[PDB]
Ligand binder design. Structure first.
Ligand SMILES: CCCCCCCC/C=C\CCCCCCCC(=O)O[C@H](COC(=O)CCCCCCC/C=C/CCCCCCCC)COP(=O)(O)OCCN
Lengths: 223, 63, 72, 147, 345, 83, 66, 70, 75, 70, 74, 78, 73, 64, 66
């Protein structure tokens, strides 16, 4: 029993030493605060953790985004659909019909690359270690990346889907600029409303002299 | 007794739309414009109701 | 009966067409009148005005027929 | 007249009456008849308290043998108790992490290793944990391939 | 500086593997009806052929190219030689045959095949060769000369897929008592054979073994000469008795590729006056290039011969018990696979 | 006769099952995007290919399976006899 | 139809006049007024054409979703 | 039923008349009303309104019938 | 004989049910997202479903025909 | 007995709804309780799927009757 | 409503079997990746099922309630 | 008649046997370079089997627990 | 009694064999005739797997049979 | 005739509606209902509008 | 009759609004001020003179045209 009490006392001493070490660590943290680099480190860590928390999951996010952009494109008419965007999406959706699409979630990012064969294939033409794609060509076969929130390419190609710049080529160069001031409809309203303005009169005397001479000419012609 | 209703429908659509949406940057309405539509509908309806009441307030003294 | 409803519908469609024309001309096309051909940004603004106006029209019609029996 | 709004209540509803089913009447393979006294035995065997105790005693014996080899005493006992402590911590840590995430993957092991390394470093010095994390993380990563 | 070259070589070999696999794939994505049948295959492999470092070499550098080429490739492994012989005696019909290893297993296979009591049709079965061995005699008259270690084997096994063919001649030598034994390149009997044999035993020094096998064989005795009789014949049966250091009965080496009129064996009887000094320097080269002869020797053309030796020689790098024998040529009895460029020649 | 009728009925049954499965699969992987309501050329080609390929596959598998099965059912009955 | 035609013809004279007349000292118009009259017309007409096109598209679409 | 079209046409002429009346009123009848006395400058601006509007009306009729037949 | 035609019709019906239960699930995973933020069919879905059905049945008939003729030329 | 097989089809599709909505919008396997942010999916998915099936059946019968007449 | 209860017994046993099968397949799909290195279930893959079963039956009952509600609103 | 009560169980056992063979095969087998079944590709199968069985057991246990609990609650509501 | 039951067992065996044939078709297709959809004729590597998958599936369908006859003895 | 006067009054009502819409409330639409400062809009708009309408019909019938 | 009454009523309900919003600015009471009564009178006279003038000039044009 005495030996057990001594062991308990030793455990208590170890706990006291750990508490002293924790106090020393707190003092070191206070010293770091006295000297903002630690605040910047904390901010960087918080940003990393926030990115890792709100990272893009393929299984739901990519399926939903693709299958929703397809719906957005359906409604439009063939005369107004940016050919390149429709083609890109038909591609992404002609793969997913197969299993060519793969996915991976990093801690701060997430990629979507294509393979040349599906995942259930057990052929040797697909399993051969000497036909698989090279390491250096992986970035040449990546499709859509989610930096922090949503996907940063699908949106980029889905941003101007309605506009079709094919039939707008009957125009000079200074009609193709589509800078935003031409869409925010504040100035056009003013210019339209300022069409009916009480016009000023300043030359009443000379104008009426001209009208008088004109009626005199008419009278002369009547005779 | 029904044509006036659709007339008001069209007129208030025109009003709300002309008075809120001013971006035309994206083909799809923003939520702010949905709030516009809601508020405009409610306000124009209350205004029409009050107009009708104050107009009957003219016939109560005219008849 | 049927003819009356048809006239009602076609009239209420012509009216909204005229109004949407007036509006989308109010908002997108500027009054400059120097080149007898449209630009690109405005030929887009027109499509977008039409789409948005029709969306709003359906939406308000729905939210208003809502307030046809709920106001009883 | 079936009144779908009522048959559902009798099937799925507070109006339903008790049911006496059989285990095999449903399901492909009838689960083998099992004693009602062994299921708690398996629950205890799988619960990672037992696995943590296993790690404790295993690290104890390991440190004992290590002190036996290094001398040719007392250091062996210290190595044994230390190994037992760290193993009992690591096992229970990875168990809790897994039971939370529900998935068995290298993430659990690396996380538990970093936790133990950082805790030990901080017990000695905060700056030490910042490297003990990575050290024991790489250790428990390579252990999977050695596993 | 040193490891970098090693890594670069590994990289280039991976590259070559990948390229050849692509070509084989091209050969494998070819259409066929369902009722049709595919060209089968049967692979005989002796793992302990070069140094035991064959299994891996074959599984890496040529097995793929066999599996992509669209052919039912059944692999077999010959634990020992008698196993191969019996197996091949009990083998069934197929469409091709393949053998991976030095000329030893190849000779064993050809024996098991043409010894087949009831089949002169197997002599129609196109066999293939894959030189997993460090050195080969056929590879010079059958494949590209050489690149790396792996380019040779890759191109060789690829020629099989190419579907070419080449008629080659063999020779049957009969033990008066033992069953016949067939061979493609020839047999050799004498000093240089013993030297080439014992070189492995002297493994302690890599640089000196290439010469000290001969060196030490000299210190036993220089006049390592032995006599025997022969009765040969032309492409009438005149005999010759003679004593030498070494004798080699071999096939031609040049006119197998092109067209000519004659069908004749080639023999090479050696003198016995050579000094030990010229003996070491020449054996050291011969062990790596057995084609050449020492000097001024006699090599008369024949077709069929017989050897009478007074009371142990090697056939295509396989040891055998010596005895009086009857040796005969079979012209264009087999069909092999050659690179197409050589076929052009 | 009723036995042969039942047999041909079962044959028709699995035939139609195959037909349904084939429709499902060829539409699931020769029709990615439906933007036009009408079938175009490349998709008709994908259909022809999938169907022909699948039919040939099924023929091949039937051949191999009828080659093998007898040995396996014989093994089955033999083990039963041993038991 | 005819009614639509005359109505747009009346609306367009109104808008183009109201838009491109900034001289009211004279009795007669300068050629710039003709340039407007000719530009306003084609521009308004392309506008109305695009609008009617998109409207008919929406119309057949809504008729195709019953 | 051509006289029906003709009375339609005169109705449209009347609507154009009222539209142009309103247009010129907004254009050169300022919103002051300080004096009911119709001013001289406006007295003739009205003449100019009507003249120019009718000129544009006929020019547009011509050009637009040309466009339609085109 | 009567029972034969009865069972044939029953079986045709069962196969039609199978095709229906396959078509619903195939069009689901191609028009409907898992988003389910809304609680009622939007326009995109109410269109993509009509378009999936106006195509699946086309395929059904086309394959029926090409398949019967292929099986006939086979034998 | 026909109404009975009808109700059986109903139960079958109800199991189908359960499984489908489950697989689609039940992911976080951390706790033993239905997360409040995914017990609303269920409510949505349910009626979504019902309306989907109704629309499908409508188009299916429309097509089959378009054929039957021809 | 008595014959109703008999029919209820029958359809109940049947639908319960069907749901058992669905739940088996779904919990397999979610809580068990295809690795199959060892037989004994891992720890997480032994609790994920205790979590799938309940998260599935609660779903079942919620759908039952909502569906009865929609049905009475015919 | 009483044979049907067990015929159904036997037939369901066969159905699941095939349905399970298919899955173990899809997941284990990945080497079509030899007509013979490798050792890994059969121990993997045995493990697929045993894991599926141990899973089904746990499933049924938890389901039965849930059911008895809910039934006790129902009976107590009375 | 056992004769009639043995017969029914053979019937169930036939049904099982048909089910297995169908699943074999499905799997051996999904696994080694991947979607390229440019030609209606089978290639060579495929026509080989198609012949291997069968002998590699039937070995499993038998091993599992022995195992399950053991456990559910 | 009198029915033409009825539809005339209807059009006049529809007219005064928009006549006062802009005067009362600005195009802000931040709040979904009327404030009190504008709750007095219409009882003033319509009153004055009808006063003016009648006093104008007076001067119109004057010449009539 | 009515072929000439519609225009009169239109003039009436048009001048109503065109003058109700020119000088009626202060909105605090429920009655008009004399600044608005005289305003409306001037509206009436000025608008009537304007309309009769426009009609006279329209007829003058139509005369000088044919
Ligand atoms: C500049 C020269 C110095 C070199 C230093 C090293 C740099 C490394 C950068 C990455 C190189 C690219 C190669 C990536 C790995 C390739 C492996 C591969 O095959 O890809 C995937 C493996 O997936 C991955 O893990 C992808 C690799 C992702 C790399 C992550 C590293 C993150 C680094 C980000 C770089 C950004 C640079 C910006 C700097 C920011 C600093 C502030 C294979 O998947 P399978 O299952 O085989 O499917 C194929 C079936 N046929």
């Amino acid at each position: 029993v005495v030996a057990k009490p001594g062991v308990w006392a030793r455990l208590g001493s170890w706990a006291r030493a750990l508490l002293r070490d924790y106090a020393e660590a707190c003092r070191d943290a206070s010293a770091e605060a006295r000297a903002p680099g630690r605040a910047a480190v904390y901010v960087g860590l918080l940003g990393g953790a926030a990115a890792c928390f709100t990272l893009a999951p393929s299984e739901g996010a990519f399926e939903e985004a693709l299958l929703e952009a397809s719906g957005t494109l359906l409604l439009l008419a063939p005369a107004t659909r940016n050919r390149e965007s429709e083609a890109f999406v038909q591609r992404l959706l002609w793969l997913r019909g197969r299993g060519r699409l793969r996915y991976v979630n990093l801690g701060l990012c997430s990629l979507v690359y294509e393979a040349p064969f599906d995942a259930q294939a057990s052929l040797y033409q697909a399993r051969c270690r000497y036909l698989q794609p090279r390491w250096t060509d992986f970035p040449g076969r990546v499709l859509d990346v989610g930096f922090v929130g949503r996907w940063w390419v699908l949106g980029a190609w889905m941003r101007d889907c309605d506009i079709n710049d094919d039939e707008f080529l009957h125009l000079p160069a200074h009609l193709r600029v589509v800078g935003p001031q031409q869409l925010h409809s504040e100035t056009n309203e003013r210019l339209f409303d300022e069409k009916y303005k009480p016009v000023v009169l300043t030359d009443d005397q000379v104008d009426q002299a001209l009208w008088e001479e004109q009626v005199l000419q008419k009278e002369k012609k009547d005779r | 007794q029904f044509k006036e209703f659709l007339g008001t429908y069209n007129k208030l659509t025109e009003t709300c739309f002309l008075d809120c949406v001013k971006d035309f940057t994206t083909r799809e309405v923003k939520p702010e414009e949905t709030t516009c539509s809601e508020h405009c509908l409610q306000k124009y309806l209350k205004m029409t109701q009050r107009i009708s009441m104050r107009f009957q307030e003219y016939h109560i003294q005219q008849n | 009966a049927q003819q009356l409803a048809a006239e009602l519908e076609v009239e209420m469609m012509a009216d909204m067409y005229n109004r949407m024309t007036s509006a989308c001309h109010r908002k997108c096309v500027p009054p400059h009148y120097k080149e007898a051909e449209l630009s690109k940004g405005e030929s887009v603004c027109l499509d977008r005005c039409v789409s948005k106006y029709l969306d709003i029209h359906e939406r308000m019609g729905k939210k208003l027929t809502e307030l046809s029996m709920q106001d009883e | 007249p079936l009144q779908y709004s009522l048959l559902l209540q009798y099937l799925v509803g507070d109006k339903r009456q008790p049911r006496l089913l059989e285990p095999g009447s449903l399901g492909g393979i009838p689960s083998p008849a099992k004693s009602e006294e062994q299921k708690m035995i398996e629950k205890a065997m799988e619960s990672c308290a037992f696995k943590a105790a296993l790690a404790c005693v295993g690290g104890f014996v390991l440190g004992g043998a290590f002190g036996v080899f290094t001398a040719g005493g007392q250091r062996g006992m210290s190595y044994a108790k230390n190994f037992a402590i760290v193993g009992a911590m690591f096992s229970c840590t990875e168990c809790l992490i897994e039971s939370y995430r529900g998935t068995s993957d290298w993430k659990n092991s690396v996380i538990s290793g970093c936790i133990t390394g950082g805790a030990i470093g901080f017990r000695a010095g905060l700056k030490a944990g910042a490297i003990g994390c990575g050290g024991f993380a790489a250790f428990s990563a390579a252990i999977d391939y050695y596993l | 500086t040193w490891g970098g070259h090693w890594l670069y070589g590994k990289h280039c070999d991976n590259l070559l593997r990948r390229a050849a696999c692509q070509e084989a794939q091209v050969f494998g994505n070819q259409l066929i009806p369902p009722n049709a049948q595919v060209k089968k295959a049967t692979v005989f492999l002796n793992p302990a052929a070069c140094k035991g470092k064959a299994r891996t070499l074959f599984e890496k550098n040529a097995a793929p190219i066999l599996h992509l080429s669209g052919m039912d490739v059944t692999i077999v492994k010959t634990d020992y030689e008698g196993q191969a012989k019996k197996l091949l005696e009990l083998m069934e019909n197929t469409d091709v045959i393949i053998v991976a290893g030095g000329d030893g297993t190849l000779q064993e296979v050809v024996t098991g095949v043409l010894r087949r009591t009831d089949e002169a049709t197997f002599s129609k079965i196109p066999i293939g060769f894959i030189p997993l061995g460090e050195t080969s005699s056929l590879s010079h008259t059958l494949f590209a000369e050489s690149g790396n270690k792996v380019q040779h084997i890759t191109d060789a096994t690829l020629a099989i897929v190419k579907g070419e063919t080449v008629p080659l001649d063999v020779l049957q030598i009969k033990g008066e008592k033992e069953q016949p034994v067939f061979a493609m390149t020839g047999l050799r009997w004498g000093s240089f054979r013993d030297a080439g044999v014992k070189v492995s035993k002297y493994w302690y020094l890599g640089p000196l073994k290439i010469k000290a096998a001969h060196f030490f064989s000299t210190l036993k005795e220089w006049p390592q000469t032995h006599q025997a009789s022969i009765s040969y014949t032309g492409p009438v049966w005149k005999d010759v008795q003679l004593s030498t250091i070494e004798l080699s009965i071999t096939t031609r080496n040049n006119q197998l590729d092109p067209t000519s009129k004659e069908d004749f064996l080639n023999i090479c009887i050696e003198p016995d006056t050579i000094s030990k000094g010229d003996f070491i320097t020449i054996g050291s080269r011969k062990v790596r290039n057995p084609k050449l002869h020492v000097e001024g020797t006699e090599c008369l053309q024949a077709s069929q011969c017989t050897l009478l030796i007074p009371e142990s020689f090697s056939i295509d790098s396989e040891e055998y018990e010596a005895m009086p024998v009857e040796v005969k040529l079979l012209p264009r009895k087999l069909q092999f696979f050659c690179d197409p460029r050589k076929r052009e020649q | 006769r009723q036995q042969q009728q039942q047999q041909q009925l079962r044959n028709l049954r699995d035939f139609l099952l195959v037909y349904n499965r084939m429709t499902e699969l060829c539409f699931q992987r020769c029709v990615p995007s439906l933007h036009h309501r009408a079938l175009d050329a490349e998709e008709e080609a994908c259909l022809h290919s999938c169907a022909g390929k699948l039919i040939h596959s099924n023929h091949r598998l039937m051949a191999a399976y009828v080659q093998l099965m007898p040995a396996l059912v014989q093994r089955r009955i033999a083990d039963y006899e041993a038991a």
